Chains A and B, each alone.
Chain A
Amino acid sequence: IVGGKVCPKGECPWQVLLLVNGAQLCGGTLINTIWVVSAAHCFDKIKNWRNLIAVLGEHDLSEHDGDEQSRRVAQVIIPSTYVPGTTNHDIALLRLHQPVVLTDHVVPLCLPERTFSERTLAFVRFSLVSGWGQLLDRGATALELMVLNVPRLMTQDCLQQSRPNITEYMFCAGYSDGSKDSCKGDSGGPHATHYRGTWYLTGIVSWGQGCATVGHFGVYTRVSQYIEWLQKLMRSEPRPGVLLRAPFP
């Protein structure tokens, strides 16, 4: 996250940290006790599918304070339309091997209904993006979880205000003055929208031209397009093998 602030401990309780062989991979969002939503592009280079860990209640990477909960990722579900190395349909649904325990530090973000998300949430101007990604373009990653408030743009405005294509499965958010943005290591993390006292999942940190590049905005997976796809999978029985490609729509 570029130009944000430290998320006070426990104020982003749905934030997930994804690890591969103990190394920082991506972010994710907890949506109930066993499911996490992340970005499909996070898994393009994975070979050790069995060494993928999700950490909940994480805040400071240099210290174990007891609120952290680690779980093995039992399944990574990606839409059939996602093509590795590309940006469209950038979403993954992760099943944890064992549920996390909900505490003051581990709480899911509401996955909203499609209609509510399209006709109401899509018009809330500002939303929060968070992660332990780079603090600067070509800079070091954060030790404490960072958060940033970003305004959402209509795609027509994003295309006009900018210096890959922006599809109906994406949306732009951020600033064009090179000061504030999500970064590479924030990938898969939440774009969370507040509405009438409750927070909802509206976007996933997906891609951009560098980090906080002048004349460019952050690009987020438009989660509303995947609500029914996500809901159907969550009502399904697990299958052998970690990676699962599922028909989209």
Chain B
Amino acid sequence: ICVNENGGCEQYCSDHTGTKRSCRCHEGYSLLADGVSCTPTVEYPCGKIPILEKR
């Protein structure tokens, strides 16, 4: 599932026994209830530009 379009994950993808898939996020992010989206949990999450984010 993960090889094709990142398994629909915004960030990391793990394939599981069967047709199961788990999306995951880098530290400083949490996975939303959609099971694909990552939201920041800290003020300065990695790979985001504050001056552009606050604009």
Using CB atoms and an 8 Å cutoff, list the residues of chain A in contact with chain B. 8, 10-11, 13-14, 31-32, 102-104, 107-113, 115-116, 119-120, 196-200
Contacts and interface: CB of A to CB of B under 8 A. Distances in A.
Given A104-B50, A115-B12, A115-B13, 16 more contacts: A11-B49, A31-B46, A102-B43, A102-B44, A107-B49, A107-B50, A108-B44, A108-B47, A112-B26, A116-B13, A196-B11, A197-B10, A198-B26, A198-B38, A199-B47, A199-B49
Interface residues of B, number: 19
Interface string B1-29: 01100100011110000000000001000
Chain B facing A: main interface SS? loop
A200 B47 contact: yes
B33 interface: no
A11 B52 contact: yes
Nearest to B38: A198
A242 B50 CA distance: 33
A40 B10 CA distance: 32
Contacts of A115: 2, 12-13
In this complex, the member of B3, B10, B26, B47 whose beta carbon has the largest number of chain A beta carbons within 10 angstroms is B47
B4 to A, nearest CB: 9
A196 B10 contact: yes
16 contacts: A8-B51, A32-B46, A104-B54, A107-B44, A107-B47, A107-B48, A108-B46, A109-B46, A109-B47, A119-B3, A120-B6, A197-B48, A198-B11, A198-B26, A198-B46, A200-B47
